[PDB]
C-alpha cells in the first residue's frame, strides 16, 4: 500500500509484466497440471490414477496428442512440443519476476510511471475529464497524506485535521 | 479501472488481511513458483537428443512415445535439493499438485471477493495492541489502517453524503 500511494506501482509497466508473469505462471501451473491429469493414459485398473505410474518407466504417462487436440479446439492454440511447453513454464514467471525487478530498481530512484503527463495536462484545465486513472491518483493522495504521519515517524509529519485530502462526508 | 477496483476494495474490505486472499496469493505465488519449478526441472532433465548447434526443443517430436525428459533425474535433482520426501517422484501426483495448488488458491481468493461482497471484511486489528494505561500501541495493521483510511476518504469524493460508508 506504500507503493500504490507513493509510487503508483500498479500503473508501472514493469509491474504489469510481473503480474502477467506471475498470473501467467499460476495459469500455466493450473492448466498444465489439469491438462496432464485429464489426458492420462489408463495404466492401472483402479479408479484412482496416481498408482498407475512407476517412475522407472519410459512411457509418457499422459496423452500429449489428445492434450494438443483438446487445446487446439478449445483455445485455438496448443503446445505440441513438450520441451517448449516446459521451457515456457520456466520462462513466464521468471521473466515476470525479472521485469518487476527492473521497475523496483527504477522505484529505488523514485522513477515511477506515476503520471501520464498528457492526461494531467488534460485534467488540470478540464474539470470534467475524469478517468479511472485520475481516480487512482486521488486515492494515492489519500494514501500519501493519511498514512505518512504514522508510516514515517522520523519526518515529524504533523498533518492537521484540515490538510488531509477527504472526499465529501468521509 | 482494475487498479481502482483493487484500491477501493482494500479501503473498504481490507482484502490483504482477509486470509482467503492470502490463500489466493499463496495460490498464485505458489502457482508461479511451481510453474517455474516444474518448468525448470523438466528442462533440466531433458535427454540429449540434439546438438548444441540447434535448439534442444527438437529433441521432442510431437506424439512420440518416449518421455522427453528423465523423471528419475529430476526427482534425483529436486530430492537432493530439499530432502527426498518433499519431492513428487510420481508425475501424476506432481501434476495434480500443479493443478490443485493455484486452482484451490484462486478458488479461495474468488471466495475472498465473494465473501467480501457481503462485507465479511478482512481481519480488523485496528487498535489491538494497547498498553497498561490503555494507549493504543500501533501495529503494522494500524499503518495499513491509515492507508486504508486514505483511500476510503478519497474514493468517490462526491458520492458520500453521510459519514458511514455502508455499501
Amino acid at each position: 500500500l506504500f507503493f500504490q500511494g507513493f509510487h503508483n506501482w500498479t500503473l508501472n509497466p514493469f509491474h504489469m509484466m510481473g503480474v502477467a508473469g506471475v498470473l501467467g505462471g499460476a495459469l500455466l501451473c493450473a492448466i498444465h497440471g489439469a491438462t496432464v491429469e485429464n489426458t492420462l493414459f489408463q495404466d492401472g485398473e483402479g479408479a484412482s490414477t496416481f498408482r498407475a505410474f512407476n517412475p522407472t518407466q519410459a512411457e509418457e504417462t499422459y496423452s500429449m496428442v489428445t492434450a494438443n487436440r483438446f487445446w487446439s479446439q478449445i483455445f485455438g492454440i496448443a503446445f505440441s512440443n513438450k520441451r517448449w511447453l516446459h521451457f515456457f513454464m520456466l520462462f513466464v514467471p521468471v521473466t515476470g519476476l525479472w521485469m518487476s525487478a527492473i521497475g523496483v530498481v527504477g522505484l529505488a530512484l523514485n522513477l515511477r510511471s506515476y503520471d501520464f503527463i498528457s492526461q494531467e495536462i488534460r485534467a488540470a484545465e478540464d474539470p470534467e475529464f475524469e478517468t479511472f486513472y485520475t481516480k487512482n491518483l486521488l486515492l494515492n493522495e489519500g494514501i500519501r497524506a493519511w498514512m505518512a504521519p504514522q508510516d514515517q515517524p522520523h519526518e515529524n509529519f504533523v498533518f492537521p485535521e484540515e490538510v488531509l485530502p477527504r472526499g465529501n462526508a468521509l | 479501472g482494475t487498479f481502482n477496483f483493487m484500491i477501493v476494495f482494500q479501503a473498504e474490505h481490507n482484502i490483504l488481511m482477509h486470509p482467503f486472499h492470502q490463500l489466493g496469493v499463496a495460490g498464485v505465488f505458489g502457482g508461479a513458483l511451481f510453474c517455474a519449478m516444474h518448468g525448470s526441472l523438466v528442462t533440466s532433465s531433458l535427454i540429449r537428443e540434439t546438438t548444441e548447434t540447434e535448439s534442444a526443443n527438437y529433441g521432442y517430436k510431437f506424439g512420440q512415445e518416449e518421455e522427453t525428459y528423465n523423471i528419475v533425474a529430476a526427482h534425483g535433482y529436486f530430492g537432493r535439493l530439499i530432502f527426498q520426501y518433499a519431492s513428487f517422484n510420481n508425475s501424476r501426483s506432481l501434476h495434480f499438485f500443479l493443478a490443485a495448488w493455484p486452482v484451490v488458491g484462486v478458488w479461495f481468493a474468488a471466495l475472498g471477493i465473494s465473501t467480501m461482497a457481503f462485507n465479511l471484511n478482512g481481519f480488523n486489528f485496528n487498535h489491538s495492541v494497547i498498553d497498561a494505561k490503555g494507549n493504543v500501541i500501533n501495529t503494522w495493521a494500524d499503518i495499513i489502517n491509515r492507508a486504508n483510511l486514505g483511500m476510503e476518504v478519497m474514493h468517490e469524493r462526491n458520492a458520500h453524503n453521510f459519514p458511514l460508508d455502508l455499501a
Binding site: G76, I77, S80 | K61, F62, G63, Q64
Partner: peptide, 29 residues
C-alpha cells in the same frame, strides 16, 4: 495519432487469426 496507434491491437487480432488457423500444424511423429 494516439488512438489509431493503439487500435497495435488490430495487429494482435490478425496474429490471433493467423496463429490459430494458419499455424504450421502439429505432426504426429
Amino acid at each position: 495519432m494516439e488512438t489509431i496507434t493503439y487500435v497495435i491491437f488490430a495487429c494482435i487480432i490478425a496474429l490471433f487469426f493467423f496463429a490459430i488457423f494458419f499455424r504450421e500444424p502439429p505432426r504426429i511423429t
